[PDB]
Structure 1
Amino acid sequence: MDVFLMIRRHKTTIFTDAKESSTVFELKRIVEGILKRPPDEQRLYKDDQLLDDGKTLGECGFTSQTARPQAPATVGLAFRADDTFEALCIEPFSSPPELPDVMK
């Protein structure tokens, strides 16, 4: 039923819970109370694509099999550095270290 998403922006993930087919404007109000920023400055993206305020999460592609609690989906974040978007690309996680060869 419930789906979990992560808002990553320049090596900074934000774990925020939302509904399956909820409005996009409702998700921006939750980040306002944690970042002390107006919701009009944030911009949610999905696979390098600008979303709309009139649409919902269920119409884009936020299903139960995709945004599972065990493996959430990456959500883009873009602020307002001047008048347009700011961030767009993030950085992946690090690589695992060398495994001990004495155990294999």
Structure 2
Amino acid sequence: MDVFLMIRRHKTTIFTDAKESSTVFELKRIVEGILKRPPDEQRLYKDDQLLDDGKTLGECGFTSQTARPQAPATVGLAFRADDTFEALCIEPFSSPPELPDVMKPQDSGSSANEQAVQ
């Protein structure tokens, strides 16, 4: 019945929960309590697609089959200045480092040095 979400815009993420069969509008209300800005200014996007309040979140494809507590779905968020909308732009999370030799599985060794091992 529940779907687990992350609402993201520009290096901020909110971990939130919402019902599968609830409206896109309901989610804007959750955002208003925490961020303390009106729903009307906000825009919620799914894969850079504008979402309307005639649409519910299960229909957007945020069903519990793809949305998990382990890995949530991403909801895009934009604000408006007044009338004119800013549109999406999410700055990403830093890349995870290069995978080191040690974690790669084994491969053949090398012939012993002449001197003692340091």
* Residue aligning to 2:3: 3
CA displacement, residues 1-36 of structure 1 (integer Å, 9 cap, x when unaligned): 311110110111111110112111111111111111
* Residue aligning to 1:79: 79
CA displacement, residues 18-77 of structure 1 (integer Å, 9 cap, x when unaligned): 011211111111111111111111111001111111221111211111111111111110
Q: Which runs of 5+ in 1 are unaligned?
A: none
TM-score if structure 1 supplies the norm length?
Answer: 0.87
After superposition, the CA RMSD in angstroms is 1.7
Q: Which has the larger radius of gyration?
A: 2
Bigger RCO of structures 1 and 2 (CA < 8 A, at least 6 apart):
1
Q: Which runs of 5+ in 2 are unaligned?
A: 105-118
